[PDB]
């Protein structure tokens, strides 16, 4: 009963969140990748400096 009731609520809460937050995840996660390139260039410039 719980598994049914709760997981149905979970799946609705998840898919409602996911719709709003998968977009914001991509927004947040594609920004993280920018740090990984902003760092890697930083070192080569410091090294070359």
């Amino acid at each position: 009963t719980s598994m049914k009731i709760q997981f149905k609520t979970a799946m609705p809460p998840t898919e409602v969140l996911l719709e709003s937050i998968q977009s914001k995840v991509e927004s947040i996660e594609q920004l993280q990748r920018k740090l990984q390139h902003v760092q890697p260039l930083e070192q080569q410039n410091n090294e070359m400096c």
């Binding site: 914001k24 927004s27 947040i28 920004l31 993280q32 920018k34 740090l35 902003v38 760092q39 260039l41 930083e42 410039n45 410091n46 070359m48 400096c49």
Partner: protein, 58 residues
């Protein structure tokens, strides 16, 4: 998400600060290279002058 944008821009400011000082050091070197390269050119011309001068005397 807003915090991550403040964190990102800070890195790229340092990318410029490094960029400027790196090009600035190379900029100073360039003048030195051109200063001496002329002086070496002056030396070689004078070198070649003697080389033939000493011959034409003898």
């Amino acid at each position: 998400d807003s915090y991550l944008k403040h964190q990102e821009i800070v890195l790229d400011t340092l990318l410029p600060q490094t960029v400027s000082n790196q090009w600035r050091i190379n900029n100073d070197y360039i003048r030195q290279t051109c200063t001496i390269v002329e002086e070496m050119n002056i030396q070689q011309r004078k070198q070649i002058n003697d080389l033939e001068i000493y011959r034409k005397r003898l």
